[PDB]
Amino acid sequence: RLVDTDGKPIENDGAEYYILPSVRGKGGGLVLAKSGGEKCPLSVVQSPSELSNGLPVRFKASPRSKYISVGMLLGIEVIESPECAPKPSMWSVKSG
């Protein structure tokens, strides 16, 4: 079952969460960075520092459920993001 690190279900469009690596010694929580030719930090990366929780996200699933589950399609909004990023800052997939 899908729960947070304190064993509580994850809220739909409610509390913010950090997305953290289970393994240690290999980077921190997910954040944003400039990649290649980018002049605005738009690329999702793990933080270089293992200590960092990265940036908070809000889960956005269309069903009216109070809590998300595994296998449920959702969007991921990065709640704190660069002024230069589109707002709300939603994850999506791009080529390159």
Partner: protein, 71 residues
């Protein structure tokens, strides 16, 4: 060319709902991407040319995660 990557740079996507899912995966969870062709693809990590650990579509090699509630 390089692996498709996760971005916030596309202003044209839904602000509610989305193509991602969370699934169970060896000692934690994984993030997956519901591709336009109808296969869910694992998101994983690729280290890029500036030593960034990029979240990318990495079929069969998921980044295993846990979710910490803010506060």
């Amino acid at each position: 060319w390089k692996l498709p990557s996760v971005t916030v740079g596309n202003p044209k996507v839904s602000v509610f709902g989305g193509p991602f899912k969370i699934e169970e995966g060896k000692s934690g969870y994984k993030d997956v991407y519901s591709s336009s062709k109808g296969r869910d693809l694992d998101d994983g990590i690729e280290v890029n040319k500036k030593k960034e650990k990029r979240l990318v579509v990495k079929d069969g090699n998921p980044f295993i995660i846990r979710f910490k509630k803010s506060g």
